[PDB]
Design an enzyme around this catalytic site. Structure first.
Site, PDB file in Angstrom:
ATOM      1  CG  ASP A 230     -30.620  90.061  30.776  1.00  0.00           C
ATOM      2  OD1 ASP A 230     -31.461  89.302  30.312  1.00  0.00           O
ATOM      3  OD2 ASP A 230     -29.911  90.754  30.070  1.00  0.00           O
ATOM      4  CB  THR A 231     -33.520  85.211  33.783  1.00  0.00           C
ATOM      5  OG1 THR A 231     -34.600  85.999  33.297  1.00  0.00           O
ATOM      6  CG2 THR A 231     -33.463  85.337  35.295  1.00  0.00           C
ATOM      7  N   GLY A 232     -32.258  86.232  30.865  1.00  0.00           N
ATOM      8  CA  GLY A 232     -32.143  86.028  29.457  1.00  0.00           C
ATOM      9  C   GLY A 232     -30.717  86.035  28.990  1.00  0.00           C
TER      10      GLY A 232
END
EC number: 3.4.23.16
Lengths: 99, 99
Positions: B25-27
């Protein structure tokens, strides 16, 4: 571009004449943008994450320009601090995770 | 590898001798995993997401293997919809977004 993750992957998007900063997010199924007034009909939908669910409005076939790339799809609008581009658009612009 | 986003980017990790699946999850800034007993002293921590604020257990310098690449760093444990690997350990394994 190749984007590194040393810092949050903020990118410039454009929806209508709106210019906006957005997080490219592989962990999000959908794109949710902060409160804006888009044209068209909208369904309410509940979406969740860390902490719970928030109610958002669902708009379809909204065109968003991500760094020189035109993507068009479902956009959810609701009380998020941060604009989120999730996997429904990222596949459209060819985005990939590599290591 | 190169991972496409038509599907959720779910991966198998090894932490405390246990195999788990986790979302890349780059978020997320932090790695937060479902409730588990790891060894270490831990500090109570509070974080927030699309839904809001929550209490987690923070553990430092935990070794994690993500597709056979090893990372060593902080891991938060608490009520998350899905285990996620955040940017703190995706930088360690040299992960990038590309398009």
């Amino acid at each position: 571009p190749q984007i590194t993750l040393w810092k949050r992957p903020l990118v410039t998007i454009r929806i209508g004449g709106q210019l906006k900063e957005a997080l490219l997010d592989t962990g999000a199924d959908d794109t949710v943008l902060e409160e804006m007034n888009l044209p068209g009909k909208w369904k309410p939908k509940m979406i969740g994450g860390i902490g719970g669910f928030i109610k958002v409005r669902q708009y379809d076939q909204i065109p968003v320009e991500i760094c020189g790339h035109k993507a068009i799809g479902t956009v959810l609008v609701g009380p998020t601090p941060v604009n989120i581009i999730g996997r429904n658009l990222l596949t459209q612009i060819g985005c990939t995770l590599n290591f």
